[PDB]
Amino acid sequence: SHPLITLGLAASAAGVVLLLVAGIVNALTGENRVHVGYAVLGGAAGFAATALGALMALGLRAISARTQDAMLGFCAGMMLAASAFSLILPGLDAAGTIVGPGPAAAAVVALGLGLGVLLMLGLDYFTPHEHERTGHQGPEAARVNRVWLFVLTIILHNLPEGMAIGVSFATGDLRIGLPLTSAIAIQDVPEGLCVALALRAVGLPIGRAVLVAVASGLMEPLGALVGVGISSGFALAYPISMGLAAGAMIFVVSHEVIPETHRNGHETTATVGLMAGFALMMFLDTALG
Ligand SMILES: CCCCCCCC/C=C\CCCCCCCCOC(=O)[C@H](O)CO
Ligand SMILES: CCCCCCCC/C=C\CCCCCCCCOC(=O)[C@H](O)CO
Ligand SMILES: CCCCCCCC/C=C\CCCCCCCCOC(=O)[C@H](O)CO
Ligand SMILES: CCCCCCCC/C=C\CCCCCCCCOC(=O)[C@H](O)CO
Ligand SMILES: CCCCCCCC/C=C\CCCCCCCCOC(=O)[C@H](O)CO
Ligand SMILES: [Cl-]
Ligand SMILES: [Cl-]
Ligand SMILES: [Hg+2]
């Protein structure tokens, strides 16, 4: 039944297109106007922090692969900690006030986690892009400009970070939105440096690589629109979407980032980066309040 694979392909494609487009459409309804406001501003702060990091690449231009793998692990560790403490744990509390505490509330967040993996896995199959380890991925990718493939890798990476900012603001609760957005925005400064350096390395002169890195940061306000929309349809959509954004980010770290550091032989340097970034975000979870 190749009809069945065509049916699943149609449902898969429409399901990811629908999530993104219906998220934006739902975000733009009148009931969400205040929440979208906070979420896009949070996203625009991440764009600004990305821009700042990218500007710092004009000085460095290129770095040892060992240093690059450390910095990628560092940003990755910050995002694992942001997923755990700024999305999963508040999602648990939010779920508990809707369905009751205990494992039933964890089931809300856990199902969202799985939905986030499925969304990113589907985008990973349908979006042509390229990694320096496994080469080009996605439909028709072998005959796509290689710089553009790497740009799309960066776009896929930052979609969940934008979505997380949107989800965290979906109820107007700055107690949730500010810690999450602070974590992503601080992480975006080293990340903008890594992105500009990686774009330079795939063939752009440093000045154009910096400008493309700055433009890539616009995925965070855009993804924040998606996050607002998917998290606001009904009361449970909010803790489910917390888990969804967390699972999408965890996929980016474990599927997109950490594998790039392992096959170069710098598993050990990436690991010290992961530990430091995770520890740092824990600290900032309590120092920033
Ligand atoms: C990489 C992914 C990029 C996706 C590209 C974006 C695709 C979406 C393009 C245009 C969407 C326009 C939505 C306007 C919403 C109208 C709701 C108007 O509000 C209303 O209907 C009432 O207020 C209800 O309360
Ligand atoms: C509420 C959460 C919704 C999340 C959506 C999850 C459902 C889809 C999840 C994963 C889809 C992966 C399918 C793999 C496609 C195989 C090559 C397909 O590549 C191709 O060749 C195409 O023909 C190109 O268009
Ligand atoms: C607020 C955001 C402002 C930023 C606006 C975006 C600025 C975009 C800047 C530069 C993009 C131009 C790319 C240069 C050609 C790349 C060829 C690379 O491919 C090649 O090596 C050969 O051409 C192969 O075809
Ligand atoms: C919401 C997030 C939006 C993010 C937008 C990112 C904008 C990035 C802008 C330009 C990417 C430059 C790489 C393209 C390589 C092909 C150059 C073109 O090759 C060429 O040289 C022409 O064929 C001849 O001039
Ligand atoms: C409470 C919420 C639960 C959330 C669960 C998310 C945590 C799981 C995240 C990452 C698992 C580790 C991924 C790396 C694969 C390790 C062996 C992979 O082995 C291999 O195949 C390669 O050769 C080496 O990497
Ligand atoms: Cl990351
Ligand atoms: Cl250069
Ligand atoms: Hg980084």
Cβ distance 196 to 205 under 8 Å?
no
Q: Identify how the structure was determined.
A: X-ray
C-alpha of 178 from chain center: 17
Paired with 137 in beta bridges are 129
Q: Which of 15, 13, 23 is nearest to 223 (CA)?
A: 23
The DSSP letter of residue 148 is H
In short, whether 262's Cβ falls inside 6 Å of ligand 5 is yes
Q: Which of 205, 24, 236 is nearest to 112 (CA)?
A: 236
- Helix ranges (DSSP H) in 56-173: 57-60, 65-81, 89-99, 103-126, 146-168
Ligand 2 pocket test, pick from 7, 126, 241 with the greatest ligand atom count within 8 Å of Cβ, gives 126
Residues 271 and 2: their CA atoms lie apart, in Å, by 43
Query: Which-ligand-closest: CA of 218?
Result: 4
Question: Of all helices (H) and strands (E), which one includes residue 281?
Answer: helix 267-287
In short, whether 219's Cβ falls inside 6 Å of ligand 4 is yes
One-letter identity of residue 102: G
Q: Can you give the resolution of this entry in Å? A: 2.0
- The distance between the two most distant Cα atoms of the chain, rounded to a whole number of Å, is 57
One-letter identity of residue 172: G
Residues 277 and 267: their CA atoms lie apart, in Å, by 15
Cβ distance 181 to 42 under 8 Å?
yes
Q: Which atom of ligand 2 is nearest to the CA of 116?
A: 2
CA distances, 53 to each of 210, 230, 280 (Å): 9, 30, 18
Residue at token pair 């050990």: 268
Ligand 4 pocket test, pick from 216, 219, 226 with the greatest ligand atom count within 8 Å of Cβ, gives 216
Q: Which of 196, 222, 203 is nearest to 52 (CA)?
A: 196
Number of other CB atoms surrounding residue 238 within 10 Å: 25
CA distances, 280 to each of 84, 207, 288 (Å): 13, 31, 12
End-to-end CA distance of the chain: 56
Number of other CB atoms surrounding residue 141 within 10 Å: 16
Paired with 129 in beta bridges are 137
Residues 124 and 156: their CA atoms lie apart, in Å, by 8
- Sequential DSSP letters for 202-269: HT--HHHHHHHHHHHTTHHHHHHHHHHHHTSSSTTHHHHHHHHHHHHHHHIIIIIIHHHHHTTT-HHH
What the block records as the tokens of 238 is 């909010």
Tell me the HSE value of 230 on the side-chain side, using a 13 A CA sphere: 32
Residue at token pair 């993104």: 20
